[PDB]
């Protein structure tokens, strides 16, 4: 299925994922596509920061859902 990852600058990535994929697999797919290390990524959907171990189905993330990506680039 397709989900979207939107940054606060309005730029949007499209990812093909499975409902059983963990959030860590999602951050890995973002690194494979954008070169952003997972330790710099934070993902938000439906008012929650997403935990790496949980699956997309755990957070009720279905097709065409849009996640918000936040980068930790300062202080770390």
């Amino acid at each position: 299925m397709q989900i979207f990852v939107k940054t606060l600058t309005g730029k949007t990535i499209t990812l093909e994922v499975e409902p059983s994929d963990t959030i860590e697999n999602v951050k890995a797919k973002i690194q494979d596509k954008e070169g952003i290390p997972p330790d710099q990524q934070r993902l938000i959907f439906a008012g929650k920061q997403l935990e790496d171990g949980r699956t997309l189905s755990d957070y009720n993330i279905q097709r065409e859902s849009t996640l918000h990506l936040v980068l930790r680039l300062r202080g770390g």
């Binding site: 940054t7 730029k11 990535i13 596509k33 954008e34 680039l73 300062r74």
Partner: protein
């Protein structure tokens, strides 16, 4: 895609320049303080040196007056 990558690389370059500026600002502030601290410690030891300096010259002036008295006495 590419544009999300370009925005990430720009922000990484921006953070790196911000860290070089803080590293330079820190080093400039510390070296200025250290140079001030070393000058104060050097000044304190010079004043201790001059205190011993006039102590020994006072002792020499006292020894000269005694030497003069002894020379007049023993030279018959």
């Amino acid at each position: 895609p590419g544009e999300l990558r370009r925005e990430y690389e720009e922000e990484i370059s921006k953070v790196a320049a911000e860290r070089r500026a803080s590293e330079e600002e820190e080093n400039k502030a510390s070296e200025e303080y250290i140079q001030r601290l070393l000058a104060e410690e050097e000044e304190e030891e010079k004043r201790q040196a001059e205190k011993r300096r006039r102590a020994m010259e006072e002792q020499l002036k006292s020894d000269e007056e005694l030497a003069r008295k002894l020379s007049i006495d023993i030279n018959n």
